[PDB]
Amino acid sequence: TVIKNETGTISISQLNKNVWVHTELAVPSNGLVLNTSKGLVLVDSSWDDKLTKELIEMVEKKFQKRVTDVIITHAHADRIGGIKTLKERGIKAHSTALTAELAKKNGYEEPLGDLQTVTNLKFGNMKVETFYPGKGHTEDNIVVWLPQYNILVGGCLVKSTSAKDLGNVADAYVNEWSTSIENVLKRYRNINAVVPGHGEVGDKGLLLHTLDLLK
Ligand SMILES: O=C(O)[C@@H]1CS[C@H]2CS[C@H](CS)N21
Ligand SMILES: [K+]
Ligand SMILES: [Zn+2]
Ligand SMILES: [Zn+2]
Numbered sequence: 001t002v003i004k005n006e007t008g009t010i011s012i013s014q015l016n017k018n019v020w021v022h023t024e025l026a027v028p029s030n031g032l033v034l035n036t037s038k039g040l041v042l043v044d045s046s047w048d049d050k051l052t053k054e055l056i057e058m059v060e061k062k063f064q065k066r067v068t069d070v071i072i073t074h075a076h077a078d079r080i081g082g083i084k085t086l087k088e089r090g091i092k093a094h095s096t097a098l099t100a101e102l103a104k105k106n107g108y109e110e111p112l113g114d115l116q117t118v119t120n121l122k123f124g125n126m127k128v129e130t131f132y133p134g135k136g137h138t139e140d141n142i143v144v145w146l147p148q149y150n151i152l153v154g155g156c157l158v159k160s161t162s163a164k165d166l167g168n169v170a171d172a173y174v175n176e177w178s179t180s181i182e183n184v185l186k187r188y189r190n191i192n193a194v195v196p197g198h199g200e201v202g203d204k205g206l207l208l209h210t211l212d213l214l215k
Helices: 049-063 083-089 097-105 176-187 205-213
Strands: 002-004 010-016 019-024 029-036 039-043 067-071 092-094 118-123 126-131 143-146 151-159 193-198
Touching: 010 049, 019 049, 029 126, 039 049, 049 067, 049 083, 083 092, 151 176, 151 205, 176 205, 193 205
Parallel strands: 039 067, 067 092, 151 193
Antiparallel strands: 002 010, 010 019, 019 029, 029 039, 029 193, 118 126, 126 143, 143 151
16 A cells, blocks of 8 residues: 655555555645556656655665656646756656746746647556646646546646645636536546545545535
8 A cells, every 4th residue: 555755755555556646745745656567657746856856766666667757737846846856867747838838937947848738648558648628726737547547637626625725826717727627527427536636535526526615
């Protein structure tokens, strides 16, 4: 189930053979780790370089292969904070153009801007779809879908059950957010699990929960 770095800093818990969640801390942030035959792939980095370096260290050691790619889901620090570490180790950082621009705007190094509204990738082995459903928690927020496992990384668009309000809405679009959630509920009709950007893993109800927090 759950391995852990020396300090409290970091944890990784399994969902299936090839798919784990990574969580880092005062506030917990989540992403995914995908074990493929061609390398490790992360959905999202972490808060800052130190922690992203530690996360990369822990998964390379444990799975005995390299992190080759990361998918960045939006341009806030918890997503993009370890971008310097990625870029300089030759780790590919995929994102939409929008997310790339917003990163350069907030003074981060740029990810690739290679992702479109729908983009289907494959690593091995592992199939990944990225979907941009519209504006919500940020302007640029995308979700990630694993069709082989019907698994959705909702990111910071999607709130956990324990979450009782919308968090920081300074960069949010609270009218479009409901529509973009629906756009996800429409696109992906059978969901086995949903990973929120912050908090505990759940299912389709996290999305209805978020819908409810927007009323
Ligand atoms: O607005 C939120 O819910 C989250 C968690 S706490 C707050 C500040 S950091 C992170 C950027 S996604 N954000
Ligand atoms: K398949
Ligand atoms: Zn955010
Ligand atoms: Zn976040």
